[PDB]
Design a protein around this ligand. Structure first.
Ligand SMILES: C[C@]12CC[C@@H]3c4ccc(O)cc4CC[C@H]3[C@@H]1CC[C@@H]2O
Ligand SMILES: C[C@]12CC[C@@H]3c4ccc(O)cc4CC[C@H]3[C@@H]1CC[C@@H]2O
Lengths: 6, 230, 226, 7
């Protein structure tokens, strides 16, 4: 998820 | 970022500051271990989304690969929440201002098994910031240092050097003597060792709350905790 | 309190003179037995060293105990990282126990800790860390790590900061370079703190799984982290 | 033990 939100 | 002056650095950092969020505190029922951990994790999870946007606005951060950005935020997120909490709490001696509707004292920490020791460490850091008269412009530099430093073990090191120059310029402009500038720089950075410590102890705490099914952890907060492979 | 009346040169001299000796060492269980047998012997020398750090014996017995319980594994690790600086890719636990990264794997969960220690070594090598800097950093760890859990301690810490800056000025750094280097050095202490907390969990885990029996001084310092 | 070695 973090990779996506970045 | 490397060509910013100190004054442009401070503006960008102050400009980037995330909002203060509210908790979902409901004063109609007593606290339990589960409901207090629910409030705190709900708050954290909402703050993490704002933290991600804030990081993107930290000069130098968006120059890194997506892999390096992910790693830094995974390493630093809990330190960054804590330093923000300690900053918010500075003008409330003996309390932690998790949110403007959630101001907790150490005895309310006792409601969750093992949290009181962590509240005590946060209260102590907030008292140190007060004793030092930590300024807003210094706090935003320290917060950026945590993001760039905590997971770094050459571009990163240059930006970190630029933030050091910025802290020194702030102190000089405030009228500290040359010797007072280095002494203060050291006192500020040595507090980061303590924030690291509290972050490690907080992560172990959150992991135990999860492993004991005290509170459900979902989504971004779940993934950031799991990144620590405890 | 003549600790606070030392010159920068006299502080460096006192720290150099206080330094502990390098001790020797001798499966998963034999490797852990070696490392903890070494640690436990080093801890006795660390207590002597602390007493020679200017300002430390001015503190109450209670505060002395607290600072050493907090700091001991940081202080062992910063020593190990220093000894290993000139052995890229290896950890010099003792002159006769020089372990490469892959020997980390002989012990469960250990390789990740070896990786962090090797990265710190590498960082010290890339900054060209000097011995005189290293003894200041080690004293800062003793005095800083448990201080928040007091005025005399902050005043001593300030004198050690002055000492680090004096060393950099003497080496010809510009003021901008001295401040930058002092920050780089102090920011490494955050990494050391992280490795100590990871290493304390690991040690506690090896104890629980009866991988290694812990006795005496080492066990009591572990137990202090409860 | 630490107490004693410190004194
Ligand atoms: C992670 C914990 C819940 C979330 C808490 C939080 C939540 C919101 C915030 O802005 C700051 C902090 C710091 C302390 C954190 C706690 C430390 C231990 C606990 O598990
Ligand atoms: C505590 C451990 C054993 C003792 C090790 C040691 C042992 C001797 C020393 O001089 C340094 C260190 C640092 C790393 C320590 C280890 C980290 C994890 C392991 O359990």
């Amino acid at each position: 998820i973090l990779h996506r939100l970045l | 970022a490397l060509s910013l002056t100190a004054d442009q650095m401070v503006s960008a950092l102050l400009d980037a500051e995330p909002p203060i969020l509210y908790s979902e505190y409901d004063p109609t029922r007593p606290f339990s271990e589960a409901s207090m951990m629910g409030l705190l994790t709900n708050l954290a999870d909402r703050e993490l989304v704002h933290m991600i946007n804030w990081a993107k606005r930290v000069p130098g951060f968006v120059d890194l690969t997506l892999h390096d950005q992910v790693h830094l935020l995974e390493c630093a997120w809990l330190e960054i929440l804590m330093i923000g909490l300690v900053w918010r709490s500075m003008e409330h001696p003996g309390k932690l201002l998790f949110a403007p509707n959630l101001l907790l004292d150490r005895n309310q920490g006792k409601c969750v098994e093992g949290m009181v020791e962590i509240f005590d460490m946060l209260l102590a850091t907030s008292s140190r910031f007060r004793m030092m008269n930590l300024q807003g412009e210094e706090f935003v530099c320290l917060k950026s240092i945590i993001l760039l430093n905590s997971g770094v073990y050459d571009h990163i090191h240059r930006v970190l050097d630029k933030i050091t120059d910025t802290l020194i310029h702030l102190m000089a402009k405030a009228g500290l003597t040359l010797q007072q500038q280095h002494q203060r720089l050291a006192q500020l950075l040595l507090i980061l060792s303590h924030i690291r410590h509290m972050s490690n102890k907080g992560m172990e705490h959150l992991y135990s709350m999860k492993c004991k099914n005290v509170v459900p952890l979902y989504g971004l907060l779940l993934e950031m905790l799991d990144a620590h492979r405890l």
